[PDB]
Design a protein around this nucleic acid. Sequence first.
DNA 1: GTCGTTAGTTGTGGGACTAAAGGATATCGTGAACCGAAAAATTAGTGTAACGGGTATCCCACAACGCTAG
Length: 122
Amino acid sequence: YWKGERSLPNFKKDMAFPFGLQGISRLVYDEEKKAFCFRLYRVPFKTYLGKDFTDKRMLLERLVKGDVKLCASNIQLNGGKIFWLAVFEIEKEKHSLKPEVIAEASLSLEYPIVVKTGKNRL
DNA sequence: GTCGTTAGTTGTGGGACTAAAGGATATCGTGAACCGAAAAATTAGTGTAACGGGTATCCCACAACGCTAG
């Protein structure tokens, strides 16, 4: 900005507006309605996992019991539906990896990924 | 004496002549002239640059807090 190679941002109107973790409250699992309930600044909200009884199902419960950390999230609205962009802080996964073993990856427009690993081609 | 018949030539024509390997050849003579056919080569004619919003995609960088008081 001192030299000048960037214009001042002109924010759009459909922006997902941000809300901090200091606003999530009354998080519980109401079994009667089969949906998590919470308040986004004094308004009830039934969460629609739908047919997602495993993927993010044990993620909100990982927060109702205080086991996963959440960051300043955002919220989108796309014409009747409402979406929450929750920045959950997930951890790394440890496998049985060998640093000496090297995978040779190449990316081209004819073959998006071509990978060598010893005698294994993918 | 004369005519058809039969058998034995006699001349003439058509059909055979291992298997295995290999496998190169050279091939004259000349009369003219005009018309038609199609296949080929040469020649004659037309040309952009940035712009308004608005929006689809790309690369490229950064963010995604924590504490205190009413």
